[PDB]
Scaffold this active site. Structure first.
Site, short mmCIF file in Angstrom:
data_model
loop_
_atom_site.label_atom_id
_atom_site.label_comp_id
_atom_site.label_asym_id
_atom_site.label_seq_id
_atom_site.Cartn_x
_atom_site.Cartn_y
_atom_site.Cartn_z
N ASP A 7 75.43 57.92 30.93
CA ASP A 7 75.55 58.12 32.36
C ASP A 7 76.74 57.33 32.82
OD1 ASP A 7 75.39 58.31 35.08
OD2 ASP A 7 73.73 56.85 35.21
N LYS A 68 85.18 56.98 39.72
CA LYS A 68 84.52 58.31 39.85
C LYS A 68 84.75 59.04 41.19
CE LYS A 68 79.99 60.39 38.71
NZ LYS A 68 78.66 60.00 38.14
N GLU A 172 73.95 65.68 36.13
CA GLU A 172 72.98 64.54 36.26
C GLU A 172 71.50 64.93 36.53
OE1 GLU A 172 74.94 61.71 38.93
OE2 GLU A 172 76.64 61.60 37.48
N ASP A 196 67.96 61.69 44.09
CA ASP A 196 68.86 60.72 43.39
C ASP A 196 69.59 59.83 44.38
OD1 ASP A 196 70.86 59.26 42.09
OD2 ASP A 196 71.34 60.89 40.68
N1 LIG Z 1 65.01 46.78 42.14
C1 LIG Z 1 65.92 47.36 42.92
N2 LIG Z 1 65.71 47.54 44.24
C2 LIG Z 1 66.59 48.12 45.07
N3 LIG Z 1 67.76 48.59 44.62
C3 LIG Z 1 68.09 48.49 43.31
C4 LIG Z 1 67.19 47.86 42.35
N4 LIG Z 1 67.78 47.86 41.15
C5 LIG Z 1 68.97 48.44 41.32
N5 LIG Z 1 69.15 48.82 42.61
C6 LIG Z 1 70.34 49.46 43.24
O1 LIG Z 1 70.62 50.73 42.70
C7 LIG Z 1 72.04 50.95 42.73
C8 LIG Z 1 72.47 51.34 41.30
O2 LIG Z 1 72.11 52.68 41.13
P1 LIG Z 1 72.22 53.35 39.72
O3 LIG Z 1 71.50 54.66 39.90
O4 LIG Z 1 71.79 52.41 38.65
O5 LIG Z 1 73.81 53.66 39.55
P2 LIG Z 1 74.61 54.92 40.18
O6 LIG Z 1 73.98 55.10 41.47
O7 LIG Z 1 76.00 54.45 40.37
O8 LIG Z 1 74.38 56.12 39.28
C9 LIG Z 1 72.71 49.68 43.30
O9 LIG Z 1 72.95 49.73 44.72
C10 LIG Z 1 71.63 48.66 43.01
O10 LIG Z 1 71.70 47.59 43.91
MG LIG Z 2 73.59 57.67 39.10
NA NA Z 3 74.04 55.31 37.10
NA NA Z 4 73.50 58.95 42.94
#
Ligand SMILES: Nc1ncnc2c1ncn2[C@@H]1O[C@H](COP(=O)(O)OP(=O)(O)O)[C@@H](O)[C@H]1O
Ligand SMILES: [Mg+2]
Ligand code: NA
Ligand code: NA
Ligand code: NA
Length: 379
Positions: A7, A68, A172, A196
């Site tokens: 990912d 990205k 995704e 998502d």
């Molecule tokens: N326990 C949690 N509670 C709230 N937000 C979280 C937690 N763990 C991660 N996040 C948030 O999720 C986001 C990361 O999302 P992720 O899906 O891992 O990556 P992307 O969105 O870039 O694909 C960040 O804003 C992070 O702060």
């Molecule tokens: Mg993501």
């Molecule tokens: Na991610």
């Molecule tokens: Na997203």
């Protein structure tokens, strides 16, 4: 010699490998199962992931992220021009295409977004190579369902620049469906909604799966709604608490604000598991400590509108797919921000108390699927 599932995320990336009938998500060197999509350049070294994010406050012009949002786009694309105002790093034109320009080892150097993204992908590869004990040459890589052909092409290029053969670029939401085994219900048509909410982007995708075949019926979202925006509400709260509690405006000092941002992020995450969190910042502004706290419900009020705005795109996708709430078979939560209880609760209220698929960690779910499909494609 296994293939890997990656990912490649706007804000966080994740790598998995299917081994012995099961998926294994590979922790990075700090033990985290996701790695920030950050590349930093200094006088001496290039830094990726956690090490790059950990020095951002001291190196804003040469610490790159959000590659990205540029990938596979033109420089004159209004999306890029608008995004450029919000970044501290320079974006330049290089015949029609954007490049990120920084200082690195005492020189000026410029990179295409897919070169930036390939560094991220290289990190993900190395982590998998130490875990397996051999070189990795094959991968599936994920992209959002809205990506055009050029954005896909540039991401696949990012893979080849990292020394990967990219077996497939997959959507995704599809990868998250595959995670949950939803392609392996047989002769039977099922409707899946992917919710998502990540760091930068919120995507809702409605899928119809028929004999294990995938059709995208609707997508909707907001490319500028995610975890970071919730972080930013916390920042503004604490900025103002500082202007009351010590009579000074830190909003002008980039280092202070960016260190506060980081503490808010950590405090946000604590609020998904506890009803309150402490924030403890040694020497925030002009020698002055900032010690304070905040409740979950106070956090929830600060984000009220943003959390409620996640519902308009769900409704919209349902109208565009010509289905009702009731006709969704499976609700799948993806993205690290779906760990937030108020977000989960709002969605539940809206889908009439249905129990939600969260057994698979939502920040790993895309890589999970990606890894399963990688192994399928190896045979
Ligand atoms: N326990 C949690 N509670 C709230 N937000 C979280 C937690 N763990 C991660 N996040 C948030 O999720 C986001 C990361 O999302 P992720 O899906 O891992 O990556 P992307 O969105 O870039 O694909 C960040 O804003 C992070 O702060
Ligand atoms: Mg993501
Ligand atoms: Na991610
Ligand atoms: Na997203
Ligand atoms: Na995101």
């Amino acid at each position: 010699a296994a293939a890997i599932g990656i990912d490649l995320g706007t804000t966080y990336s994740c790598v998995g490998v299917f081994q012995h009938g099961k998926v294994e998500i590979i922790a990075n060197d700090q033990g985290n199962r996701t790695t920030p999509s950050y590349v930093a350049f200094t006088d001496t070294e290039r830094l990726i992931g956690d090490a790059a994010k950990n020095q951002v406050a001291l190196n804003p012009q040469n610490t790159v992220f959000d590659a990205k949002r540029l990938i596979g786009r033109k420089f004159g694309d209004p999306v890029v021009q608008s995004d450029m105002k919000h970044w501290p790093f320079q974006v330049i034109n290089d015949g029609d295409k954007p490049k990120v320009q920084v200082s690195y080892k005492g020189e000026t150097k410029a990179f295409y977004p897919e070169e930036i993204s390939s560094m991220v992908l290289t990190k993900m590869k190395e982590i998998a190579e130490a875990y397996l004990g051999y070189p990795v040459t094959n991968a599936v890589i994920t992209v959002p369902a809205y990506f055009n052909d050029s954005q896909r092409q540039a991401t696949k290029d990012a893979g080849v620049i990292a020394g990967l053969n990219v077996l497939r670029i997959i959507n995704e939401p599809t990868a998250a469906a595959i995670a949950y085994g939803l392609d392996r219900t047989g002769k039977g048509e099922r409707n899946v909604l992917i919710f998502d909410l990540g760091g930068g982007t919120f995507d809702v995708s409605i899928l119809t799966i028929d004999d294990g075949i995938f059709e995208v019926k609707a997508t909707a979202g907001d490319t500028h709604l995610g975890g970071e925006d919730f972080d930013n509400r916390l920042v503004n709260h604490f900025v103002e608490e500082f202007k009351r509690k010590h009579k000074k405006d830190i909003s002008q000092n980039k280092r202070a604000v960016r260190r506060l941002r980081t503490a808010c992020e950590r405090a946000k995450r604590t609020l998904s598991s506890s009803t309150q969190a402490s924030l403890e910042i040694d020497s925030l502004f002009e020698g002055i400590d900032f010690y304070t706290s905040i409740t979950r419900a106070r956090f929830e009020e600060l984000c009220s509108d943003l959390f409620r705005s996640t519902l308009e795109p769900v409704e919209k996708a349902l109208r565009d797919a010509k289905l009702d709430k009731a006709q969704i078979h499976d609700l799948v939560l993806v993205g690290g921000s779906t760990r937030i209880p108020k977000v989960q609760k709002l969605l539940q209220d809206f889908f009439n108390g249905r129990d939600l698929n969260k057994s698979i960690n939502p920040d790993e779910a895309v890589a999970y699927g990606a890894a399963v499909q990688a192994a399928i494609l190896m045979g």
